[PDB]
């Protein structure tokens, strides 16, 4: 093939232009995103029961739904929680690669077999079923700068004049609002209600009667009498539309003839669906949205498009309204885009300076300046053909292939330039001999480099998806690289290079260009003499190779293995956890303090604080909170003390003075949609009918026995909440019957007043919203306000709860959890420093086996991936060893000559571990994938050294040490040009600081140090291996 | 696809403006478009125009005073003049619906409302005139 | 049965519409509420969208409102068909 | 149409460029293609 295109230089230019057309076409239209879909796909059912205790939500919604979640494909596990805000969240998680669409449908179908069995109050609130494994594209906030709009008002406006437009933008798939649209709110007053002998039942009945949309038919409708001229609709009651209309609802006519109006017993006012979340932005009332990225959509397109949408609307907002953007991925996506290209461009210049230093002409330097572009651009068309996206993982999978894409251009031009200066052939025929010496080896270089990266695309779980991103990007660029080294680069070597005379080693040049050729010719002389002097006692230099193998193995087992490094993303979280019982008002104080501190002590780094008094991550509740700190650009936050980690430490430390509470800051894990990070994830399970209490006691035993082994387990803790005092009102059924009081009237008097009640709908500026009845806070705050409420008996008398009820305080759960349909408590922790997570697990399991009879366990989340993915690495890379072995035996037609190539692996890796352990890095995914590219070039250099030394024996009749010392001479200059352009091209990634430094340093330090050793040592060890093997 | 040629415009109430106002605003555009016949021909709406409607308003205070249920009133009216599906029956061994409606004779003119009575709690028959009142108004036969 | 255009919109259409979000490849949604008591809501999608997957997602979101629709409407059947096809033939039936 | 008006000048532009590269591929020349590429109007004019 190379010869076909040497003589057709335009046909090969046509093909390389089309690879660039198909690959440039592939960049414009392909989805950009920070990552792809790594998390196993989950479906969440969510349901609300206004006014319900955690037990009620579980015993009338959760369990019902759960008991119907079977007969579903690829279901890994199901966890659910039932809190005391009346909310139920059931997450069903599935096998990796399950169809997110098919899973949602099957769930929905089984859910809907229980909908008829759910309470009506729950049905009316909406039992939603979304796809939960995605994560936030951006976050809009909305403030009013005149300060004339409750969060209620702003939320309504956002609900009525923003939310849909954004959710109809091209590429959006989910939008969540930080509030509700307005709700007509009747705030009952019990003093009045008793005055006129009325309960909240009368109110609710009036509202449903006087706020109604009645269908009344038509005058002159089908079927018609003959001779009819009029056809008109009959119109009757229409839903009320104003607080004024609502207040004018007639509840009762007095005996004298006076009217009892709704406004006579309650306070009508537009308000919210619920008041559980106060969301302040820099301590101002706010609303906003939590947008999400659609499956396979261009983050850049969508994100920009919204910003232009909001922009389109800003003229028309009410006075004061201001849109804010306290989070966006778009900057960090443009950053990573900018960072990878500004590393591939400096790699074309660093190969320009490297090529020009040895080959000393600009004609040769234009072939790798042209060759890498093609393989880069055209890998995108091969990734598009396989449905991959432009993501940090695929983008850094292309800077990690530089060593292999650049060697594929150096080995073609250097061998052409070498055959011309040693034999004296013209450019057109020296390329034919140069490319005959590396035709079958390059096809063998690719079949081997397949069997190295491809077994990693078969890894399982979330990890196996991360690996499937590099594995296909690299293999794609490399299969396109080896094809570019057989179509375009020999056509280029044959028409752009000028002749060199036989023997001219540039030793007759003056200036700086004379000195280097005379110092390198002797440097070639001194090296080939070393290899000789090394050959003398190869039995000595095989004993030193075993020190590299125990030094690596010793280094492999002491280097800690992480997942993916934490970046500074301009944003981070602080959690506020007041204790059990703490009113919203208290939690606000602490929250206002968190915002204050961030707006003074860190004014230079802090851009904004989005304070959410209502929900944390332990749960929702009046005692929890989350503050969202958005930092200024990384440009205005220079240094270490002005980057997230530093700021969080300062924070955690500064807040420890807070006495009546728990305030912690921390940083967002890299993959937000997985959290993971490290540690383990334990579930304690009531596998008999034991009970909440007993499961708690049993959870206690484990928590105490775990705190007595701090050597292995640190931070062993629960994730759920602790029992809280509750007020129980017990109805004496016999006393109620005796007085003529309905249990249903009693029950709704109580829950309507203290819990709230959705009654029906109304029209508010021509949109349908809900109407709710609740007591005005005055009479629903203390256990003694129950004496203010009365319930009307059949004889028509008003009766106080004290006449049929009694009360007492008790304890109960504010958050009942269930794991795979059984009661559970989820325990979180981490391995004490030094030990591995896996052995920490075995301790937990041992500890748990001791816990009382009935109490099972299991592992979820992370701990379920690893327990399902630990045996993969030794058996998949075993297959890798075997297939590359069969690829090398295929290239050298020998079951033994492969081994000489197969013995180069440690030489790079040892240096990679070294460079890693020195700097303070970890065995993370960027390390392991950088190892497979470091091994890929150190063995491709061994393939061309063993091919050049076995070709000298096979078709020229040279001896053993002759062919070895002759081949290592030919293959010296290319190994040096490659590894110099690759250590210097990777250098700015090793000294990389600021935005994106986790991913740059994790590839940089592992590739720079593993390339120092895969070139300095290999050159001395790959001739030894070829001799010890060829002689054995 | 229909398509053929021309254009397809949607005028949208992007505040809580109202049916009427959106209509007026639609009118302005339709008139200003008929003053440029050089560019735009046949500029027109696709929906329908407001039609007179008969509104029966129930005096809740008068109904309560007489002991007449709003639900009884409401279904007396809609069952009679609108129709009502009640339940199913078997017709030659297949299940079909059962509907109740007034015979056209008494559901054709606004004056046939005086023929309909609603029974109060005391057990008396009460005409709509004793708790209702009516008037003609305009409304949309097709809200888009 | 028996409803004025306003009633059909304020008790059926808007309810259903307010639940038609979180759906893939949705181009636009138009709907009409007439005085025959009928409601038609057309959701149109990107070209090449899966006619099966689109129907399912709609149905799923529709059904989160079914509990909030009037009983008179539920009993009549809230159907969800694929509307972009066209007539193969038309049979008529007379008695001579 | 508001979502499909820019397509024709840029898609047939790609068409010009790829056939140009196909003709340069057949005659091994970056200039001999143009002699083939200049026949388009001769038919089209008659079609109009």
Numbering used by the authors:
A (entry chain B): 1 to 1032
B (entry chain B): 674 to 817
C (entry chain B): 50 to 145
D (entry chain B): 866 to 913
Quote the study that presented this structure, word for word.
Resistance nodulation and cell division (RND) efflux pumps are secondary active antiporters that are ubiquitous across all domains of life. As part of tripartite multidrug efflux systems in Gram-negative bacteria, they span the entire cell envelope and export a broad variety of structurally and chemically unrelated toxic substrates. During drug efflux, AcrB undergoes a functional rotation where each of the three protomers sequentially cycles through the conformational states loose (L), tight (T) and open (O). Substrates can enter the PD through several channels and bind to the access pocket (AP) in the L state and the deep binding pocket (DBP) in the T state.
We substituted V612 in AcrB with F to mimic the sequence in the OqxB cluster and with a physicochemical similar (W) and different (N, A) residues. In contrast to wildtype AcrB, that crystallises in the LLL and LTO states, the V612F/W crystal structures were exclusively obtained in the TTT state. We thus hypothesised that the substitution impedes the formation of the L state and this in turn might play a role for the transport of L state-binding drugs such as erythromycin. As we anticipated that minocycline binding to the DBP might be a driver for the TTT conformation in the V612 variants, we solved the apo structures by X-ray crystallography. These also adopted the TTT state with an open, but empty DBP. Despite the high resolution of our AcrB V612F/W electron density maps (2.3 Å and 2.8 Å, respectively), no clearly assignable detergent (DDM) densities could be observed in the DBP. We therefore assumed that the crystallisation conditions might favour the crystal contacts leading to the TTT state for the AcrB variants. F/W612 appears to stabilise an open DBP even in the absence of a substrate, as the bulky side chain might mimic the binding of a small substrate. Moreover, the proximity of the bulky aromatic side chains in the hydrophobic cluster might introduce a steric hindrance for the rearrangements associated with the closing of the DBP required for the O and L state formations. Thus, the stabilisation of the T state DBP in its open form and impaired DBP closing are likely the reason behind the observed increased abundance of the T state on the expense of the L state in the V612F variant.
